[PDB]
Amino acid sequence: NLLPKTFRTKSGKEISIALGTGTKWKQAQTINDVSTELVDNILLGLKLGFRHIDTAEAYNTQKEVGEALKRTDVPREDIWVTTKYSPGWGSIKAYSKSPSDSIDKALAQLGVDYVDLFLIHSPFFTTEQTHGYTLEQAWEALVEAKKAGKVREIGISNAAIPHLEKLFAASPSPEYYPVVNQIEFHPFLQNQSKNIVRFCQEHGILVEAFSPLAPLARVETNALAETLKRLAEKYKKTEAQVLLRYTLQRGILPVTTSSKESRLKESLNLFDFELTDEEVNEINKIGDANPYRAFFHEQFKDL
Ligand SMILES: NC(=O)C1=CN([C@@H]2O[C@H](COP(=O)(O)OP(=O)(O)OC[C@H]3O[C@@H](n4cnc5c(N)ncnc54)[C@H](OP(=O)(O)O)[C@@H]3O)[C@@H](O)[C@H]2O)C=CC1
């Protein structure tokens, strides 16, 4: 009952909150080394109950996800795998020669016959970074991969409204529209660019939130701390569980990470309580009065 648009694994299970394999876990690209540390983390999340893994070309953790998928007792068909074509950032250019090579590279490193969700990592690139590809051309690659069956569902990350419109226009039909936009979202940044959440939800695009624990993990002072403590006390939950439940009640799918078994287990235990509309609104209000953006500050400056 939480998500306005949602999906199922190939075996027909609910897409759960996503275990991230980016941020603190990411690696230099030229590494072929598996980080046993990360593999064990992914296996642990799967045992605890995660059924959604988020990775990306740029994190160079597709190989660790692939190793976990081989070693885990959970059927692959019961898992949702999200990955991303990474076009480059500042000095760094795209690791792959083309978006289409990126997808084939994801299948190979993950050791899967299909990806559930394949996103363009960001719309903030030039064709110099991508070795010759525009946003529309990258979108064509994803559309071809969906038509082939390499990828089940297609979307983008960090897209503002004008980027979504360009995708709609580059789609051959409605069946090929983006259906996910993964953005930074938490109470101090409830709209990564103007009106993004509402726009996505009104056009059938599932919003995913990365850095949903930013108030706990990223900021030096958390203006929500008293509110989250009060609600924590009330529900007998942690302040992290409160934030992740809040995100889900806003209709948004959280992508979160932790290296600690207890926090992973807790991240999953969100379905035995429910914030009130007023508690959700309390968090909305305090959050909007204390803006904080963790990522892509120059890119969003005028968006
Ligand atoms: N599409 C995009 O451009 C981006 C995508 N992402 C994806 O999202 C994933 C998660 O992003 P991230 O910003 O890490 O998301 P989170 O908001 O879930 O934060 C991760 C950090 O929160 C800490 N944490 C967890 N629980 C608590 C708690 N109870 N109290 C205090 N700290 C806590 C963790 O530390 P500990 O390990 O000690 O628990 C961890 O370091 C990435 O791994 C990547 O997959 C991320 C950023 C951009």
Which residues are known to be catalytic?
59, 121
Please give the resolution of this entry in Å, rounded to 1 decimal. Answer: 1.8
**For residue 133, what are its two tokens?**
């590809």
The total of structural domains in the chain comes to 1
For 171, list phi and psi in degrees, rounded to 5.
-80, 140
Q: How was this structure determined?
A: X-ray
Ligand 1 mean position, distance from CA 21 (Å): 9
232 vs 173: CA distance, rounded Å = 46
With breaks defined as C to next N over 2.5 Å, after which residues does the chain break? none
> CA of 163: how far to CAs of 58, 112, 142, 219, in Å?
21, 30, 15, 29
Which residue ranges have their beta carbon within 6 Å of ligand 1?
A: 20-24, 54, 157-158, 182, 210-214, 216-217, 238, 240, 255-260, 263, 295
Q: Angle at CA 196, nearest 5°, toward 119 and 120?
A: 15
Per the structure, the complete domain to which residue 8 belongs is given by 1-303
174 alpha carbon to ligand 1 midpoint, in Å? 33
Instruction: Name which of 147, 139, 10, 5 is nearest 81 in CA terms.
Output: 10
Closest CA to 92 of 137, 122, 47, 54: 122
The CATH number that applies at residue 62 is 3.20.20.100
Minimum CA distance residue for ligand 1 atom 47: 210
Could you give the CA distance from residue 68 to residue 38 in angstroms, rounded to a whole number? 9
Neighbours of 257 (CB within 10 A): 22
Query: In this structure, which residue's CA is closest to atom 34 in ligand 1?
Result: 258
Atom of ligand 1 nearest to the CA of 267: 26
